[PDB]
PDB file of C-alpha atoms in Angstrom:
ATOM      1  CA  UNK A   1      -3.160 -18.589 -36.635  1.00 37.26           C
ATOM      2  CA  UNK A   2      -2.187 -15.783 -35.721  1.00 32.66           C
ATOM      3  CA  UNK A   3       2.119 -15.769 -37.034  1.00 33.71           C
ATOM      4  CA  UNK A   4       2.815 -12.176 -35.719  1.00 35.04           C
ATOM      5  CA  UNK A   5      -0.383  -9.915 -33.826  1.00 31.93           C
ATOM      6  CA  UNK A   6      -3.775  -9.259 -35.111  1.00 32.65           C
ATOM      7  CA  UNK A   7      -3.131  -5.473 -34.374  1.00 33.26           C
ATOM      8  CA  UNK A   8      -0.842  -4.983 -36.988  1.00 32.04           C
ATOM      9  CA  UNK A   9      -2.685  -5.846 -40.224  1.00 31.39           C
ATOM     10  CA  UNK A  10      -6.457  -6.284 -38.998  1.00 31.76           C
ATOM     11  CA  UNK A  11      -7.037  -3.048 -37.264  1.00 28.82           C
ATOM     12  CA  UNK A  12      -4.437  -1.781 -39.667  1.00 30.81           C
ATOM     13  CA  UNK A  13      -7.425  -2.313 -42.650  1.00 34.30           C
ATOM     14  CA  UNK A  14      -9.989  -1.277 -39.648  1.00 32.91           C
ATOM     15  CA  UNK A  15      -7.761   2.302 -39.707  1.00 30.80           C
ATOM     16  CA  UNK A  16      -8.563   3.149 -43.147  1.00 29.22           C
ATOM     17  CA  UNK A  17     -11.872   2.154 -42.623  1.00 30.96           C
ATOM     18  CA  UNK A  18     -12.252   4.513 -39.885  1.00 27.63           C
ATOM     19  CA  UNK A  19     -11.238   7.345 -43.330  1.00 26.64           C
ATOM     20  CA  UNK A  20     -14.089   6.155 -45.490  1.00 26.15           C
ATOM     21  CA  UNK A  21     -17.118   6.023 -43.004  1.00 27.41           C
ATOM     22  CA  UNK A  22     -16.366  10.156 -43.053  1.00 28.84           C
ATOM     23  CA  UNK A  23     -17.191  10.360 -46.834  1.00 29.36           C
ATOM     24  CA  UNK A  24     -20.585  11.513 -45.678  1.00 32.17           C
ATOM     25  CA  UNK A  25     -19.767  14.231 -43.123  1.00 29.35           C
ATOM     26  CA  UNK A  26     -22.423  17.002 -43.990  1.00 28.61           C
ATOM     27  CA  UNK A  27     -26.157  14.941 -44.956  1.00 33.05           C
ATOM     28  CA  UNK A  28     -26.097  12.114 -42.397  1.00 31.31           C
ATOM     29  CA  UNK A  29     -23.748  13.581 -39.262  1.00 26.79           C
ATOM     30  CA  UNK A  30     -26.220  16.309 -38.968  1.00 28.99           C
ATOM     31  CA  UNK A  31     -27.946  14.097 -37.113  1.00 28.55           C
ATOM     32  CA  UNK A  32     -25.521  13.073 -33.663  1.00 27.44           C
ATOM     33  CA  UNK A  33     -23.836   9.939 -31.397  1.00 21.66           C
ATOM     34  CA  UNK A  34     -23.316  10.265 -27.939  1.00 22.11           C
ATOM     35  CA  UNK A  35     -19.906  11.617 -26.782  1.00 19.80           C
ATOM     36  CA  UNK A  36     -18.123   8.955 -25.458  1.00 17.48           C
ATOM     37  CA  UNK A  37     -14.596  11.783 -25.631  1.00 18.90           C
ATOM     38  CA  UNK A  38     -16.134  14.225 -23.777  1.00 17.88           C
ATOM     39  CA  UNK A  39     -15.393  12.320 -20.749  1.00 16.73           C
ATOM     40  CA  UNK A  40     -12.862   9.573 -21.152  1.00 18.76           C
ATOM     41  CA  UNK A  41     -11.807   8.495 -17.022  1.00 22.07           C
ATOM     42  CA  UNK A  42      -9.669   5.931 -17.941  1.00 18.98           C
ATOM     43  CA  UNK A  43     -11.207   2.995 -19.964  1.00 17.72           C
ATOM     44  CA  UNK A  44      -8.890   0.723 -21.952  1.00 19.64           C
ATOM     45  CA  UNK A  45      -8.265   0.694 -26.137  1.00 22.26           C
ATOM     46  CA  UNK A  46     -10.655  -3.105 -26.196  1.00 20.04           C
ATOM     47  CA  UNK A  47     -13.784  -1.319 -24.847  1.00 21.32           C
ATOM     48  CA  UNK A  48     -13.453   1.794 -26.049  1.00 24.72           C
ATOM     49  CA  UNK A  49     -14.007  -0.185 -29.824  1.00 21.51           C
ATOM     50  CA  UNK A  50     -17.224  -1.936 -29.064  1.00 20.90           C
ATOM     51  CA  UNK A  51     -18.109   0.959 -27.753  1.00 18.63           C
ATOM     52  CA  UNK A  52     -18.350   2.919 -30.683  1.00 18.00           C
ATOM     53  CA  UNK A  53     -18.846  -1.084 -32.140  1.00 18.94           C
ATOM     54  CA  UNK A  54     -22.789   0.000 -30.862  1.00 19.53           C
ATOM     55  CA  UNK A  55     -23.147   3.359 -32.170  1.00 17.01           C
ATOM     56  CA  UNK A  56     -22.296   1.928 -35.042  1.00 15.81           C
ATOM     57  CA  UNK A  57     -24.375  -0.996 -35.833  1.00 15.11           C
ATOM     58  CA  UNK A  58     -27.310   1.715 -35.210  1.00 15.38           C
ATOM     59  CA  UNK A  59     -25.995   3.329 -37.415  1.00 16.01           C
ATOM     60  CA  UNK A  60     -26.120   1.001 -40.055  1.00 15.65           C
ATOM     61  CA  UNK A  61     -29.194  -0.447 -39.240  1.00 10.53           C
ATOM     62  CA  UNK A  62     -31.620   2.795 -39.403  1.00 12.86           C
ATOM     63  CA  UNK A  63     -29.380   5.736 -41.203  1.00  9.41           C
ATOM     64  CA  UNK A  64     -29.234   2.879 -44.028  1.00 10.16           C
ATOM     65  CA  UNK A  65     -33.240   2.451 -44.684  1.00 10.64           C
ATOM     66  CA  UNK A  66     -33.873   6.317 -43.357  1.00 16.65           C
ATOM     67  CA  UNK A  67     -34.322   8.962 -45.898  1.00 16.26           C
ATOM     68  CA  UNK A  68     -33.176  11.744 -44.042  1.00 14.52           C
ATOM     69  CA  UNK A  69     -29.798  10.889 -44.856  1.00 14.82           C
ATOM     70  CA  UNK A  70     -31.371   9.416 -48.716  1.00 13.23           C
ATOM     71  CA  UNK A  71     -31.577  13.006 -50.270  1.00 12.69           C
ATOM     72  CA  UNK A  72     -33.234  13.684 -53.746  1.00 14.56           C
ATOM     73  CA  UNK A  73     -31.114  12.153 -55.992  1.00 16.33           C
ATOM     74  CA  UNK A  74     -29.833   9.067 -57.901  1.00 16.95           C
ATOM     75  CA  UNK A  75     -25.825   9.049 -57.929  1.00 15.55           C
ATOM     76  CA  UNK A  76     -26.689   9.762 -53.419  1.00 17.44           C
ATOM     77  CA  UNK A  77     -28.186   6.719 -54.048  1.00 17.93           C
ATOM     78  CA  UNK A  78     -25.788   4.335 -54.953  1.00 16.02           C
ATOM     79  CA  UNK A  79     -23.497   5.557 -53.268  1.00 15.85           C
ATOM     80  CA  UNK A  80     -25.289   5.128 -49.886  1.00 15.58           C
ATOM     81  CA  UNK A  81     -25.104   2.321 -49.945  1.00 15.58           C
ATOM     82  CA  UNK A  82     -21.067   1.759 -50.304  1.00 18.37           C
ATOM     83  CA  UNK A  83     -21.518   3.594 -46.720  1.00 22.74           C
ATOM     84  CA  UNK A  84     -23.599   0.650 -45.586  1.00 24.91           C
ATOM     85  CA  UNK A  85     -21.356  -2.037 -46.141  1.00 28.43           C
ATOM     86  CA  UNK A  86     -18.409   0.044 -44.812  1.00 30.13           C
ATOM     87  CA  UNK A  87     -19.339   0.778 -41.633  1.00 32.27           C
ATOM     88  CA  UNK A  88     -21.540  -2.980 -41.036  1.00 35.95           C
ATOM     89  CA  UNK A  89     -17.439  -4.239 -42.032  1.00 35.45           C
ATOM     90  CA  UNK A  90     -15.872  -2.530 -39.038  1.00 39.19           C
ATOM     91  CA  UNK A  91     -18.836  -3.322 -36.255  1.00 42.52           C
ATOM     92  CA  UNK A  92     -17.140  -6.883 -36.174  1.00 48.25           C
ATOM     93  CA  UNK A  93     -14.386  -6.086 -37.102  1.00 47.26           C
ATOM     94  CA  UNK A  94     -14.183  -3.002 -34.354  1.00 50.24           C
ATOM     95  CA  UNK A  95     -15.907  -5.227 -31.089  1.00 49.54           C
ATOM     96  CA  UNK A  96     -14.193  -8.805 -32.585  1.00 50.23           C
ATOM     97  CA  UNK A  97     -11.111  -7.209 -30.797  1.00 51.59           C
ATOM     98  CA  UNK A  98     -11.915  -6.197 -28.356  1.00 51.00           C
ATOM     99  CA  UNK A  99     -14.213  -8.892 -27.089  1.00 52.69           C
ATOM    100  CA  UNK A 100     -17.709  -7.721 -24.104  1.00 49.74           C
ATOM    101  CA  UNK A 101     -20.606  -8.276 -25.911  1.00 51.60           C
ATOM    102  CA  UNK A 102     -21.622  -5.911 -22.942  1.00 53.34           C
ATOM    103  CA  UNK A 103     -21.309  -2.441 -23.608  1.00 52.17           C
ATOM    104  CA  UNK A 104     -23.786   0.534 -21.984  1.00 53.50           C
ATOM    105  CA  UNK A 105     -22.999   3.305 -24.361  1.00 53.29           C
ATOM    106  CA  UNK A 106     -26.303   4.835 -22.868  1.00 57.98           C
ATOM    107  CA  UNK A 107     -23.594   8.303 -20.027  1.00 61.09           C
ATOM    108  CA  UNK A 108     -23.075  11.377 -22.251  1.00 59.40           C
ATOM    109  CA  UNK A 109     -24.305  14.664 -24.052  1.00 59.83           C
ATOM    110  CA  UNK A 110     -25.317  15.140 -27.668  1.00 58.76           C
ATOM    111  CA  UNK A 111     -22.642  14.983 -29.091  1.00 61.24           C
ATOM    112  CA  UNK A 112     -22.147  15.394 -33.306  1.00 56.22           C
ATOM    113  CA  UNK A 113     -21.818  12.781 -35.325  1.00 57.13           C
ATOM    114  CA  UNK A 114     -18.815  15.055 -37.245  1.00 55.96           C
ATOM    115  CA  UNK A 115     -16.018  15.587 -34.877  1.00 55.26           C
ATOM    116  CA  UNK A 116     -17.219  11.954 -33.266  1.00 52.51           C
ATOM    117  CA  UNK A 117     -15.952  10.944 -36.406  1.00 54.99           C
ATOM    118  CA  UNK A 118     -12.943  13.335 -35.954  1.00 53.87           C
ATOM    119  CA  UNK A 119     -12.065  12.253 -32.598  1.00 53.47           C
ATOM    120  CA  UNK A 120     -11.908   8.744 -34.098  1.00 55.84           C
ATOM    121  CA  UNK A 121     -10.089   8.427 -37.154  1.00 57.92           C
ATOM    122  CA  UNK A 122      -7.370  10.690 -33.872  1.00 55.87           C
ATOM    123  CA  UNK A 123      -8.557   7.842 -31.625  1.00 55.24           C
ATOM    124  CA  UNK A 124      -7.160   4.878 -33.673  1.00 52.82           C
ATOM    125  CA  UNK A 125      -3.791   6.647 -34.944  1.00 50.18           C
ATOM    126  CA  UNK A 126      -2.743   7.382 -31.985  1.00 46.82           C
ATOM    127  CA  UNK A 127      -3.535   4.005 -30.062  1.00 47.37           C
ATOM    128  CA  UNK A 128      -2.627   1.813 -32.471  1.00 48.16           C
ATOM    129  CA  UNK A 129       0.580   1.942 -31.916  1.00 51.23           C
ATOM    130  CA  UNK A 130       0.757  -0.033 -28.476  1.00 52.77           C
ATOM    131  CA  UNK A 131      -1.057  -2.804 -28.979  1.00 50.71           C
ATOM    132  CA  UNK A 132       2.172  -4.739 -29.055  1.00 48.80           C
ATOM    133  CA  UNK A 133       3.567  -5.677 -25.375  1.00 47.67           C
TER     134      UNK A 133
END
């Protein structure tokens, strides 16, 4: 089924979705998140995708039905379901390519969902330029 590669087209749409996840960078990113980009000795690109894929998992399960991220507006609701569908999509498109179920992401200080979403985009733009071989 593969022809050229599974990193130019698939991962490409995964990067665009990455920037879309930074739309709610104010009320939903006020909580926190492990800093996987705080001390990365020498992990792999597929291991980094699964790690951030687990953190994103809990982000689309509870924060989608939590009131802390809801707010208090009729338009904020219709816009919320939009970020929940884009996030759950990247959940399988990020690690689905990695190939690693076990992903112990419980070793890091309490970073912020903001600085983490920024380092997520950057990491996808410089690391995605090394999938070919």
